Write a protein that binds this ligand. Structure first.
Ligand SMILES: Nc1ncnc2c1ncn2[C@@H]1O[C@H](COP(=O)(O)OP(=O)(O)O)[C@@H](O)[C@H]1O
Ligand SMILES: [Zn+2]
Ligand SMILES: [Zn+2]
Lengths: 488, 114, 562, 58, 148
């Protein structure tokens, strides 16, 4: 039964039902369906006068479920297809899909863009040598409580056509992946699918990913990356396909993410699971008064009911679309468009990848220890999939460079922003506070020739301590970064 | 002499307020609570302070709704907002260390007393 | 006076003599939008002009300034103008700067002719004496109140105009006192535009089932606040239904039938559940006081007494077990007398065709009213908003066609949602007691509430107003008082103020009460410097600024013309 | 309040049968099945005296 | 006391209109000195009385209006020049633009001006208002040629 309509303090009751002739093989497990049928009674082989009830199905209807068992088949009607083509021809459908995700959540615009990229997904490719590459992206929202990450998980589970919502504490290794159970009558083992089998071709959402057990986290690695679960248990060996896009939410190991604390201490995840994730969105609370007053007004408008009026008016405005239309558009974009890349896009993509790897050199130089947030070749495949999803928004078969720079912007906003989180410093600060006075400026070439060519300090100490004085806001930069000015 | 209302009446009163009366925030102020939340986020900048999130504004809204539910009034008044803000401010002040309880009490005294 | 009923046909002939030309368009029908009666009236007129091939331009107008803008840009080729639902109160020569000297052609012999005819189809019984008597160009389709009531004012105006010491003062001041006694009188309606146009169609001979159904809708739409008009016009509709019905039968896809059958005084009975029909009805909540929890307990108790289970009552009327709905008249007769709901029993008109279901007149006019309402720097916002309700009016015109029943079902769903919003805001008003007693009038000001952007519409605020008048009319402990209903618009930042007349309870069976808000609104607008809008065709609809609201109400309660 | 939400259960306090007509309480304690077989008809007649045509509901 | 006083107007304690804003926008010209007593003062054209603006504060000797008009032209063109030479900062990183022409920062924030977009137009609107009030016809002509 529907979880929204369960009675108080009880369990949802499973009821056995039957289909005949062309009503068979119409529903995937996990969908929400309305069924019309007769409520008949049949005698079962298992007290007094107990005859078990069932429902003989006369009719199946489901807007969330489409095309029965999936055959990549176009069953959308012609005027709805023309309306969907009109939506794909819209010049600002990207902002429409961004505003469609979480209308009652202020901020988190890059998270909403990554969610839309997760819902559209990449393109699955097949090579002649059997090389299968991933066509889905996995996004991990790591951050402080009160950032509405779990509400984003719930809204992703609502919008997506195939989606399941799971826990970290309520999970298990045989629960997320497929389990091996025993049939009672035959006494033979059989595989019953888990949460990543019910989400095949769709979205799995994990809440409190930081807390799920260490033996429980690592049964997911082939199901995230290889898109398959290889099970050899109880005399049954098989490789089931699980094409699941993973959306996980987590807090750091410490209670809140601390900017004073090192990023290695906040994350006790292995580097493998962050290599598998594609958007590692680390979110914080900066306590800005404008942001606090804006979120205060927004949540007040949500609680009073005025946000119902604003979203109902803005739907008729045409800048937002509902759950059903966006769900069917996700299904149509996955079933119609699977784009390739232009040759000029590959130069920009490879150049940005070697640029961010060269930046990872600079990130891992001075700390001398390995970063907990790695950028590997799988992250280049991630940016490829982001570009292909950005092409899949507007049914574009060619992923041009305009989509490429937005993909680069999303990756810099998520993963490069996440990865960027003794006597020399104090001696530089004293020498520079005595060297240039309050209200006067110095060129960077003067500091280079007098503090590096003199070998008073290193160049890395200069580059770090200029930023250190910048964030202290007593000495800032002016005139295109070529002047250092003491604000005083 | 130990309680104004009898317990047998009070339990049924709580059950009837829970299952029948659903208050709603319509004619509320909804600007004083914004300044209260902004000031709570500003004074939650201390290292060992009680954390304030968006959930605490929503907590103020449930405490005001529960205070409106206690009177069996389907609409929330501004007095219920004042009492909810007083409870949340008093909890935040009692959570703070005694070096700054006087400063934190004088900082939010304009919202609770008036 | 210029057109009695027996010569409406003659007036139509004059329209043909100015407009029956294939080469050019010469007839423009100005229709008051946001009125069901004018919508049905213009639908019958458009069918009549389509059957005879008269070129036409139907223009919906909201405001008086919108009327002046549309009349100012009219071409000189147009010689026939029809003003539907308005133009009976103001002086059209003083408003549209009409001077007969530049509009006269071939004055030669005491005969006068003009190059433009402006016909008025107005139901507001305050008639301007210059307009109805001293005007040749402005031609009125009078119901017949001029021949019975307005004779003393006719002779007073005629000896006022004819005669341009004690004798002169003694007669002229007496006639001016009679004329100023007829003026400063409240606004009322005793006849519908659809009835007058159907009388014209009876005089011509173009009556059929569709025009009769449109006349039934136009008469039925006045049953909310003008029940004496519907009770007067009901036997003529009964005679016409029994005249144009066929001889008899089996349900077949082509036979449209239109029966006089029991159609109870309920909100959307045949397109909603019985529980939702009793729960959202104005009369049921008016008597049993459904706004508090005791009224809901009494509604559930009478569902127990009627023998209808709440599982069956909340089921859709079309899917309802007919062991409940076949003998529902007997159950209504046996059970509603103890709860005071005897006046639910009412015979109305129910039309069906084919196998697509039956529709009543009341359900159809609430669907049309909902399609008027929510069917789809500040001056640009007002212009766009007026364009939005003109688009709503044309959507409701599209719903009048037989082949567009999907628009009718959309109107049914919109009526259900709008009645839910009206019920929520009505119990919002009643729970916190925003109704204030000011000893001459009752004041209700909406400062904030659920979905307050629906109340920038006039008819939605009138729906809330009729909800309040029905709810307060059955409470005899407070007497009959006029109501001021103000709703705030934050983006426009204006209080839209509606004046509502009280009424007697429906069970009683006299002289109708008048609308005395327009006189006070005009006098306060003249005396004070309030920046207000008088342009609405219903003169009890004004727009005030927020900052000028309380001085306007203080000058209103100081004035004794309420 | 049985008729209010279409309930079918009528609660009877046994102490009320102890205060008045204690022979009925003794007969209910000794032979409960036949006593309830009379009692449901008695309660149905008492309901129909106040809510006529209640048998269509339950 | 303010809470009790705001009850009679039917306003809440913390309303949008109930809070106070300064009704005078500060227009100051820096270091305008008289030639007589050499008192170097900053003249505020909005918050001062008209008697103390056209004359010296201590010497009480009237300035000619022509150099006041010239100094307002200098202040206006100083504000316009400060708008046109302008660093662009990140919306998130708050980092100055080093590479002079690029789409976005490595933090992927947009470029915004260090001066606000509305600050210059409020300054120019207050200049237009003070020119319309005090009758500086040269400054009115400057706004006329600036708009065209
Ligand atoms: N921007 C926002 N808009 C609306 N509600 C918010 C916002 N941020 C936080 N909230 C509220 O605060 C709560 C945050 O919970 P959440 O952070 O999702 O839990 P977790 O820490 O497990 O992810 C939610 O219930 C949500 O209603
Ligand atoms: Zn001087
Ligand atoms: Zn940046």
């Amino acid at each position: 039964e529907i979880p929204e309509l369960v009675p108080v303090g009880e369990m949802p009751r499973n009821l056995t039902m039957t289909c005949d002739r062309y009503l068979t093989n119409k529903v995937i497990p996990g969908t929400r369906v309305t069924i019309v049928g007769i409520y008949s009674i049949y005698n079962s082989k298992n007290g007094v006068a107990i005859r078990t009830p069932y429902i003989k199905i006369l009719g199946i209807q489901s807007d969330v479920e489409t095309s029965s068992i999936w055959n990549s088949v176009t069953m959308f009607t012609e005027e709805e297809e023309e309306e969907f083509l009109q939506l794909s021809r819209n010049p600002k459908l990207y902002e429409i899909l961004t505003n469609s995700i979480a209308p009652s959540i202020f901020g988190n615009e890059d998270i909403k863009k990554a969610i839309v990229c997760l819902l559209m997904g990449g393109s699955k490719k097949i090579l002649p040598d059997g090389m299968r590459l991933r066509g889905d992206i996995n996004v991990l929202l790591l951050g402080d409580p009160g950032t509405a990450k779990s509400q984003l998980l719930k809204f992703v589970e609502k919008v997506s056509p195939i989606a399941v919502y799971t826990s970290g504490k309520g999970s298990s290794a045989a629960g997320l992946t497929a389990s091996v159970q025993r049939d009672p009558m035959t006494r033979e083992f059989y595989l019953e699918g888990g949460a990543m089998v019910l989400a095949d071709g769709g979205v799995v959402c994990i809440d409190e990913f930081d807390k799920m057990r260490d033996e429980d986290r690592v049964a997911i690695h082939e199901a995230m990356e290889q898109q398959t679960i290889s099970i050899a248990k109880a005399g049954i060996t098989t490789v089931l396909n699980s094409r699941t896009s993973v959306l996980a939410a987590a807090n750091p190991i410490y209670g809140r993410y601390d900017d004073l604390k090192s990023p290695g201490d906040n994350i006790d995840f292995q580097t493998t699971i962050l290599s598998r994730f594609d958007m590692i969105f680390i979110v914080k609370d900066d306590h800005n008064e404008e942001r606090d007053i804006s979120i205060a007004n927004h949540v007040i408008n949500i609680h009073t009911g005025n946000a119902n009026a604003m979203q109902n008016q803005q739907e008729e405005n045409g800048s937002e679309i509902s759950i059903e239309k966006m769900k069917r558009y996700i299904t149509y974009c996955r079933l119609k468009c699977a784009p390739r890349l232009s040759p000029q896009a590959a130069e920009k993509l490879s150049s940005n990848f070697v640029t961010i790897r060269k930046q990872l050199l600079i990130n891992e130089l001075e700390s001398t220890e390995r970063s907990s947030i790695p950028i590997t070749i799988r992250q280049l495949e991630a940016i490829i999939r982001i570009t292909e999803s950005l092409a899949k928004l507007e049914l574009s078969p060619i992923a041009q460079e305009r989509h490429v720079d937005e993909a680069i912007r999303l990756f810099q906003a998520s993963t490069m922003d996440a990865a960027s989180q003794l006597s020399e410093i104090r001696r530089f600060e004293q020498e520079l506070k005595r060297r240039l006075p309050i209200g006067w400026s110095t060129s960077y070439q003067t500091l280079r020739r007098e503090f590096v060519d003199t070998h008073r300090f290193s160049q890395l100490a200069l580059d770090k301590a200029l930023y250190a004085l910048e964030k202290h806001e007593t000495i800032q930069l002016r005139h295109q970064g070529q002047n250092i000015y003491r604000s005083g | 002499e130990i309680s104004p209302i009898p317990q047998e009446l009070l339990m049924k009163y709580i059950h009837y307020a829970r299952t029948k009366i659903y208050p709603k925030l319509h004619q509320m102020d909804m600007d004083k609570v914004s300044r209260v939340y902004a000031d709570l986020r500003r004074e939650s900048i201390s290292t060992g302070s009680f954390p304030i999130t968006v959930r605490h504004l929503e907590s103020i809204l449930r405490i005001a709704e529960s205070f409106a539910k206690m009177r069996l009034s389907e609409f929330v008044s501004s007095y219920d907002l004042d009492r909810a803000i007083k409870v949340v401010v008093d909890s935040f002040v009692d959570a703070q260390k005694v070096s700054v309880r006087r400063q934190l009490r004088r900082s939010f005294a304009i919202y609770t007393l008036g | 006076m210029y057109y009695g009923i027996s010569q409406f046909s003659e007036a139509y002939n004059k329209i043909l003599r100015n407009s029956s030309s294939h080469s050019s368009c010469q007839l423009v029908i100005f229709v008051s939008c946001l009125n069901i009666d004018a919508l049905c009236a213009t639908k019958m007129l458009s069918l009549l002009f389509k059957k005879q091939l008269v070129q036409s331009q139907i223009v919906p107008i909201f405001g008086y300034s919108e009327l002046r803008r549309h009349y100012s840009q009219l071409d000189d080729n147009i010689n026939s103008l029809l003003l539907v639902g308005f133009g009976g109160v103001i002086d059209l020569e003083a408003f549209l700067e009409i001077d007969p000297q530049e509009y006269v052609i071939d004055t030669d012999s005491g005969e006068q002719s003009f190059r433009r005819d402006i016909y008025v189809l107005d139901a507001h019984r305050p008639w301007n004496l210059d307009n109805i008597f001293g005007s040749q160009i402005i031609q009125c389709f009078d119901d017949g109140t001029v021949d019975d009531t307005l004779g003393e004012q006719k002779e007073a105006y005629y000896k006022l105009l004819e005669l341009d010491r004690k004798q002169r003062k003694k007669q002229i001041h007496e006639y001016e006192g009679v004329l100023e006694e007829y003026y400063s009188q409240g606004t009322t309606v005793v006849n519908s535009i659809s009835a007058q146009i159907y009388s014209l169609l009876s005089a011509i001979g173009e009556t059929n089932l569709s025009n009769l159904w449109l006349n039934i809708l136009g008469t039925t739409s006045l049953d909310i606040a003008y029940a004496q008009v519907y009770n007067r016009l009901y036997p003529l509709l009964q005679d016409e239904v029994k005249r144009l019905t066929p001889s008899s039968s089996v349900k077949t896809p082509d036979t449209l039938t239109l029966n006089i059958q029991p159609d109870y005084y309920l909100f959307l009975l045949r397109h909603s559940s019985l529980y939702d029909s009793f729960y959202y009805s104005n009369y049921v909540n008016a008597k049993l006081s459904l706004w508090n929890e005791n009224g809901k307990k009494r509604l559930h108790k009478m569902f127990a007494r009627m023998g209808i289970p709440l599982s069956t009552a909340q089921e859709t009327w079309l899917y309802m077990d007919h062991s409940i709905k076949r003998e529902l008249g007997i159950i209504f007769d046996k059970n509603l007398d103890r709860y005071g709901l005897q006046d639910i029993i009412r015979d109305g008109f129910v039309r069906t065709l084919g196998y697509r279901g039956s529709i009543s007149a009341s359900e159809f006019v609430e669907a049309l009213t909902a399609l008027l309402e929510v069917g789809n720097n500040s001056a640009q916002k007002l212009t766009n908003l007026r364009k939005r309700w003109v688009s709503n009016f044309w959507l409701s015109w599209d719903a009048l066609d037989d082949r567009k029943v999907e628009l009718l079902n959309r109107g049914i769903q919109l009526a259900q949602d709008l009645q839910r919003a009206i019920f929520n805001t009505g119990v919002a008003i009643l729970e916190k007691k925003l109704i204030k007693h000011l000893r001459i009038y009752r004041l209700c000001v909406l400062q904030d509430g659920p979905d307050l952007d629906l109340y920038r519409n006039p008819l939605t605020l009138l729906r809330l107003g009729n909800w309040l008048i029905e709810c307060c009319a059955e409470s005899e402990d407070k007497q009959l008082l006029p109501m001021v209903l103000a709703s705030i618009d934050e983006n426009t930042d204006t209080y839209l103020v509606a004046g509502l007349t009280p009424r007697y309870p429906r069970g009683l069976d006299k002289k109708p009460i008048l609308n005395n808000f327009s006189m006070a609104f005009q006098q306060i607008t003249a005396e004070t410097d309030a920046k207000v809008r008088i342009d609405n065709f219903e003169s009890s609809i004004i727009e005030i600024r927020r900052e000028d609201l309380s001085p306007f109400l203080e000058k209103l309660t100081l004035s004794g013309l309420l | 309040t049985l008729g209010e939400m279409n309930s079918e259960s009528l609660e009877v306090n046994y102490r009320h049968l102890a205060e008045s007509k204690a022979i009925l309480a003794l007969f209910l304690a000794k032979c409960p099945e036949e006593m309830l077989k009379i009692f449901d008809l008695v309660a149905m007649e008492a309901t129909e005296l106040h809510y006529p045509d209640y048998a269509r509901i339950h | 006391l303010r809470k009790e006083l705001l009850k009679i107007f039917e306003l809440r304690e913390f309303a949008k209109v109930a809070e106070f804003k300064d009704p005078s926008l500060s227009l100051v010209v820096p270091d305008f000195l008289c030639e007589y007593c050499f008192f170097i003062s900053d003249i505020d054209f909005c918050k001062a009385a008209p008697e103390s603006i056209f004359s010296c504060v201590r010497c009480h000797k009237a300035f000619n209006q022509v150099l006041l008009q010239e100094h307002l032209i200098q202040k206006l063109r100083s504000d316009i020049e400060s708008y046109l030479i302008q660093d662009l900062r990140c919306s998130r990183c708050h980092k100055v633009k080093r590479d002079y022409m690029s789409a976005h920062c490595p933090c992927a924030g947009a470029w915004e001006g260090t001066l606000p977009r509305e600050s210059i137009v409020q300054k120019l609107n207050v200049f237009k208002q003070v020119a319309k009030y005090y009758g500086f016809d040269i400054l009115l002509s400057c706004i006329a040629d600036l708009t065209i």
